[PDB]
Nucleic acid binder design. Structure first.
Length: 96
RNA sequence: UUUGCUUUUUAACAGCCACCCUGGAAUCAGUUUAGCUGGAGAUAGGGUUAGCUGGCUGGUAGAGCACCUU
């Protein structure tokens, strides 16, 4: 809930790639600063992302409260399982 | 009364005519008679596949049918 403040700060300044496929696309690229995955996300899907994150090495990643939460945390009426923070005023990536 | 009625048909069989890729959606968009669908990837563009008792040729005019003359 410190992150819930700091996340919406990033989207104004920087950019974020929301959804599973665009997140994994960034990891192959090695261009994703961190991966945020929803708790409600399918169990198998997260495993693939956090394997990819180990290979990308600066995948790092971090868990939330909930799937439907994570969209409205962004400021989106649709819902999101996974983010990928591409690069913001707030250093989300250093502390977390 | 350029009129009213009857005939003008084609068999089984055989060949041919939901899902993926690109992509990344809020000023939300697509859509049914009705509702539903969509970052667990929508519209759109290009494909793949399912099908009926669909279309074309073969079967098949030699047959069947309606008439006419020695």
């Amino acid at each position: 809930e410190g992150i819930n403040s700091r996340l919406q700060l990033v989207m104004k300044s920087g950019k974020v790639n929301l959804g599973c496929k665009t997140a994994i696309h960034a990891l192959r690229t090695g261009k994703a600063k961190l991966i945020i995955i929803s708790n409600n996300c399918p169990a198998l899907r997260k495993s693939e992302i956090e394997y990819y994150a180990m290979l990308s090495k600066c995948g790092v990643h971090h868990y939330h409260g909930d799937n439907n939460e994570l969209g409205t945390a962004c400021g989106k009426l649709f819902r999101v399982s996974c983010l990928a923070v591409t690069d913001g005023d707030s250093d989300i990536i250093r502390s977390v």
